Design a protein around this ligand. Structure first.
Ligand SMILES: [K+]
Ligand SMILES: [K+]
Ligand SMILES: [K+]
Ligand SMILES: [Mg+2]
Ligand SMILES: [Mg+2]
Ligand SMILES: [Mg+2]
Ligand SMILES: [Mg+2]
Ligand SMILES: [Mg+2]
Ligand SMILES: [Mg+2]
Ligand SMILES: [Mg+2]
Ligand SMILES: [Mg+2]
Ligand SMILES: [Mg+2]
Ligand SMILES: [Mg+2]
Ligand SMILES: [Mg+2]
Lengths: 291, 120, 25, 102
RNA sequence: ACAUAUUAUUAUCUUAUUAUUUAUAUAAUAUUUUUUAAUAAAUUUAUUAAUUUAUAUUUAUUUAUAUCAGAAAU
RNA sequence: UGAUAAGAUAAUAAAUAUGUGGUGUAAACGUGAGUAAUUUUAUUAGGAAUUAAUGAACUAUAGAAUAAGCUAAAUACUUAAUAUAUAAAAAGGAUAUAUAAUAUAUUUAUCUAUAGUCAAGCCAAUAAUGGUU
């Protein structure tokens, strides 16, 4: 019924298809074999009724998981349970281990912190399962523009919301985060700004190997106002809008950089008609803090 | 013991008075079935020494009759001795310490008499 | 039947040989 | 042979009788926590003390192991499969698959 | 006479199973092959479901022969 | 490690043989129904077709052990690669040490080839109870 409910059904059908046995796949999903399935009377696992034909499965849209991520209740384990079941698949099922994109992990980390309120257990499922992604030939998901930056951004909010000020815990956690990055391609340059802001906030001098200086290269959405092309473009650059607004709000040193404010102007004025992504998130963190 | 050709003891004699044939046999055949060859005989009961002999220093002797040449041939072609037969062959000087195991390895035990080959 | 055709083939062969014996004798 | 020395894992006879297992902790009163008795009593003495055939042989094997610095951890006796011995497994499995899963 | 039991045989009847040998499929699977939608990714390609194409491997039915056994006769 | 504890990773110590696997039951044991011999027994200094790319499983020596798929995973299975007209293969595990998963070392297994050992197939000659009512 709801967008979340529909997305979950699509995501659960996709997994059931790819977890079905290869010998039995042609007889359970090709509608021309419905009568051959009946005759064989294969018994559904769990000693249930014999298996029945299912509708053929087609490649799933990457937007399907973005809808489910933002449907999870304010305090729920549904996102943490889906990920644990999704990433428990064999590393031989390429469709399952290649569906996850860098955007999905960013949206799983930003939703968990500001909306679902289980960030700690979402950064442990990702840290714990990073090894399987490498064995499954999908290391790109752990990058600097979607995984590292989003993590440091949520840290710049938890360190404030919670007041954490230890200069040893912060550095240790920052080192682990950088060690968890498998696709180190700094492009926007916001990573260096984010790392410097963390050091000022927690009174330490960051020093990570391989984070070479990169000048800001914020993608500028054009003044042209399209429909689904600009709704996708904004949603595409939604993560870096949450990072620009965060950088300025946490520390006023980032106000020095004028590239950050141009993107705010462009991204905000691009669809200022609609609500604000940054504000919407801030509200929920308070709505979750109160509990 | 492994292999198809094994050197092992086949039991003869009467109840409570065991005597043994040293035989080369197929692993799958019965213990007392007619073997490939009978290499020798083993009498497990030591010969009793008299009171005087004991003080005199006589040690009880267990008697083994064995075809030394034929036994070496069967070891050469890969016949596998049983544990008891292995002990007998190591004492006879046919096999060496390479056939000893960790449980019976007499690495540190004094030798009172050294193996002596004579003619009689 | 296949067994009735084999029987007759053999029966004819035996009768030809029994006659052969009479022609030879 | 000679009397080995108590260790930290096996401080006394009661600890020895518990590590070896096979219900040998029920002989703690036969030995009376005397270290020397465990390492001097042979089969004939143990038989006179009421230790049954299987247990006394097992203890003597573990006493030899201890004397030679070999592990004395309990090794369990073999047990038949859950579905029974091989000769009665086909029948048992057939009657267990028609009374559990139908 | 005969009523019984047992066995054997067959130009006969019926026949499980199996082997071998026929014909057939809009049969299944894989690959190839002709196209066709849906979906997805990227900005043509992939996937899935169909259709066409041959190929191999199976399946169902079917032709013929032999065959446990039983029936009848001796 | 995870800013709160759900999980992950490694080390250590245990558990599991109601999951997938390996090896073992062509032997041994028992019996004498059938079997009078195209088949069974016994014997011979017997034989050829002039007996397989068979090792069954140990010995000696030499070499090799590759890539995918399928299963939850593998020393399971499937399809390929390379190895004596040429054909025909495989498998890792344990423990250390050094590295950034890989490499060596040790140990135990896997595959192939050659010979040996054990062990097989087939044939001949001669003999093997009673009744010709
Ligand atoms: K009997
Ligand atoms: K008989
Ligand atoms: K090895
Ligand atoms: Mg062994
Ligand atoms: Mg018929
Ligand atoms: Mg018949
Ligand atoms: Mg099992
Ligand atoms: Mg037999
Ligand atoms: Mg390999
Ligand atoms: Mg594999
Ligand atoms: Mg295999
Ligand atoms: Mg192959
Ligand atoms: Mg080849
Ligand atoms: Mg008469």
């Amino acid at each position: 019924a709801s967008t979340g409910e529909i997305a979950k059904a699509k995501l659960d059908e996709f997994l059931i298809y790819h977890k079905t046995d290869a010998k039995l796949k042609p007889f359970i999903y090709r509608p021309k074999n419905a009568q051959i399935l009946l005759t064989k009377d294969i018994r559904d696992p769990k000693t249930r009724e014999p298996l029945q034909p299912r509708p053929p499965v087609k490649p799933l849209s990457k937007q399907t998981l973005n809808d489910f991520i933002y449907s999870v209740e304010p305090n729920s384990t549904e996102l943490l349970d889906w990920f644990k079941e999704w990433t428990g698949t064999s590393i031989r099922k390429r469709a399952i281990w290649t569906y996850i994109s860098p955007i999905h992990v960013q949206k799983m980390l930003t939703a968990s912190f500001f909306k679902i309120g289980k960030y700690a257990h979402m950064v442990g499922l990702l840290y714990g399962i990073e090894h399987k992604f490498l064995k499954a030939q999908n290391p790109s998901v752990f990058d600097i523009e979607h995984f590292f930056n989003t993590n440091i951004m949520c840290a710049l909010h938890r360190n404030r919301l919670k007041d954490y000020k230890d200069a040893e815990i912060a550095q240790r956690k920052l080192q682990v985060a950088w060690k968890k990055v498998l696709n180190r391609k700094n492009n926007t340059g916001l990573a260096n700004i984010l790392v410097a802001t963390l050091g000022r906030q927690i009174g330490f001098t960051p020093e990570l190997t391989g984070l070479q200086p990169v000048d800001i290269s914020l993608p500028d959405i054009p003044n042209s106002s399209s429909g689904a092309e600009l709704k996708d473009l904004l949603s595409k650059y939604e993560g870096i809008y949450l990072i620009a607004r965060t950088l300025l709000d946490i520390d006023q040193h980032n106000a020095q950089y004028l590239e950050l404010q141009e993107f705010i102007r462009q991204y905000q004025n691009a669809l200022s008609e609609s609500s604000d992504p940054y504000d919407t998130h801030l509200k929920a963190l308070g709505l979750l803090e109160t509990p | 013991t492994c292999g198809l050709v094994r050197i092992r003891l086949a039991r003869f004699g009467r109840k409570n008075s065991p005597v043994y044939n040293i035989v080369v046999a197929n692993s799958r055949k019965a213990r007392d079935a007619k073997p490939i060859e009978v290499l020798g005989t083993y009498v497990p009961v030591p010969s009793p020494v008299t009171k005087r002999e004991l003080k005199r220093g006589v040690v009880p002797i267990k008697d083994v009759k064995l075809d030394f040449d034929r036994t070496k041939y069967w070891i050469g072609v890969g016949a596998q001795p049983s544990e008891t037969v292995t002990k007998l062959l190591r004492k006879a000087g046919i096999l060496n310490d390479a056939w000893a195991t960790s449980k019976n390895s007499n690495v540190n035990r004094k030798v009172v008499f050294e193996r002596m080959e004579t003619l009689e | 039947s296949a067994k009735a055709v084999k029987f007759l083939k053999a029966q004819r062969r035996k009768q030809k040989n029994e006659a052969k014996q009479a022609t030879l004798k | 042979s000679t009397i080995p020395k108590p260790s930290d894992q096996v401080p006394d006879v009661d600890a020895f009788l518990n590590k070896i297992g096979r219900n040998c902790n029920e002989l703690k009163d036969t030995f009376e926590n005397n270290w020397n008795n465990l390492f001097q009593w042979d089969s004939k003495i143990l038989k006179e003390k009421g230790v049954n055939i299987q247990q006394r042989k097992y203890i003597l094997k573990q006493v030899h192991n201890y004397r030679n610095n070999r592990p004395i951890h309990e090794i369990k006796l073999g047990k038949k499969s859950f579905f029974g011995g091989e000769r009665k497994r086909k029948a048992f499995t057939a009657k267990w698959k028609a009374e559990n899963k139908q």
